[PDB]
């Protein structure tokens with residue numbers, strides 16, 4: 209009945225729980241509305257501490273040589289894993305590694321240079337993404353024979369091109385201006 | 390000597406800084422965060438960069454989450470919380486007149502338990518149907534109001550790009566009063582980066598500062614209304630110093646590099662370049678950065 | 689239109705409109721020209 | 737974005753409208769009985 213003892217417990221607990229479900233309702237409407245994605249792997253650290261998601265590089269060239277002669281603790285832990293990977297985690301062509309990542313439903317990652325990685329992210333069907341900070345810090349250059357008279361000017365060219373920023377635009381043109389995403 | 394990196398005077402044709410100390414024979418090899426630029430290559434030899442970097446943006450301390458408590462009394466206003474307990478006692482005082490002194494105290498405690506929402510007397514029946522509808526619109530309007538406050542919180546996009554600083558004026562922004570950074574914005578022809586310079590040229594108050602420290606503080610004391618533009622290395626380094634109230638936002642604007650500089654035709658030149666490359670492939674260069682930036686970082 | 693490409697866009701295969709984008713020096717418009725040029729299939733039409 | 741007592745106002749009048757109609761059917765039940 210109307211026991212003003214436990215009856216004011218009813219009205220107050222009923223109002224407390226009205227708020228809680230209202231605050232779960234409106235917040236559930238926040239993650240479904242704006243809806244931002246979050247990726248699993250944040251670095252090469254998050255690949256060395258698990259093996260459910262396979263990962264390998266190209267079968268020849270720079271990247272494979274990197275993990276090989278690596279004295280770094282984590283990368284060596286990645287290399288030692290990839291040496292005896294069953295089945296093989298290495299791929300022959302770049303087209304193989306990308307399509308292997310795509311046809312693995314999220315169970316194979318591909319390690320490659322940062323350039324082509326953000327390039328494939330712009331290609332259909334756009335089921336690839338570049339995550340985590342890069343491992344190292346390389347750079348492409350223009351190579352001339354030892355003692356070339358082309359040498360010193362071609363060097364001066366690149367510099368001038370970089371400060372005039374044509375390099376930035378040129379990247380943005382072939383990478384993002386024509387990017388399919 | 391003069392505590393400077395190196396650049397040529399426009400008048401005296403006189404090279405100052407370390408580039409000076411290298412071309413006038415005062416030193417044999419410079420090891421410092423010297424940016425490999427065009428006009429520098431013409432007077433001194435550089436090696437490959439031992440550290441890649443770029444011009445970036447710095448922001449002020451954002452408040453940490455959250456007040457919390459005063460985000461409940463905010464959706465449902467302070468003046469509407471009052472009225473819903475003024476008619477609440479206005480429904481339980483109308484329902485009390487439908488039902489000798491203590492017989493009205495157990496009935497004012499029986500109508501104040503029915504007012505705390507959860508026979509066919511058509512009287513108080515059109516109370517229980519229109520008060521219930523009254524508290525239906527209210528709960529539907531509290532639920533909707535809260536869903537727009539968490540939506541607006543996820544929409545306030547942080548100052549992502551240098552395009553963003555150019556798209557407004559409420560946040561002031563400048564760079565170092567001298568050095569490479571100011572020389573980029575000056576010389577540049579790029580659409581956006583020029584629009585930023587035309588802004589900084591005609592800036593009142595002055596957006597330019599004298600030192601790297603003077604800008605860090607200006608950011609650190611302007612309540613999030615000033616952004617300092619500087620090279621990434623120094624920016625992501627101040628992100629590790631107490632009180633940890635500066636943040637590196639958005640990708641860099643360009644792509645410079647720090648390299649070891651030797652005078653034109655130095656015997657020490659070629660081996661040093663091999664050393665930097667040797668040190669790069671070994672990882673000493675990556676490890677050394679993580680050492681000084683992060684391993685001794687107070688964040 | 690310059691920001692995306694999922695919705696194609698072109699002009700007249702000859703005339704002032706075609707020339708405008710061709711000679712444009714402005715940032716946005718020039719980028720639109722670089723698209724309409726190498727577009728596939730062709731975005732241009734012979735008549736209105 | 738900030739909510740207003742505006743929309744909330746026109747529901748306080750239906751309440752006291754349903755309250756004023758209640759004290760109208762209350763006073764007729766003690767007449768009939």
Ligand SMILES: N[C@@H](Cn1cc([N+](=O)[O-])c(=O)[nH]c1=O)C(=O)O
Nearest residue numbers: 266268269270271320321323324
């Ligand atoms: N650029 C590298 C060769 N190179 C290029 C790519 N790539 O295209 O991003 C790669 O994934 N692996 C590799 O060894 C070199 O010349 O050493």
Ligand SMILES: N[C@@H](Cn1cc([N+](=O)[O-])c(=O)[nH]c1=O)C(=O)O
Nearest residue numbers: 394423424568569570619620623
């Ligand atoms: N080291 C630069 C000069 N330089 C350095 C910094 N800094 O130390 O990050 C800066 O903010 N601005 C600048 O022009 C160069 O060599 O040009």
Ligand SMILES: N[C@@H](Cn1cc([N+](=O)[O-])c(=O)[nH]c1=O)C(=O)O
Nearest residue numbers: 699700702703704705706707736
């Ligand atoms: N007016 C233009 C000709 N002209 C006309 C049309 N049109 O009919 O609206 C058009 O779409 N493009 C064009 O070049 C000229 O005189 O050059």
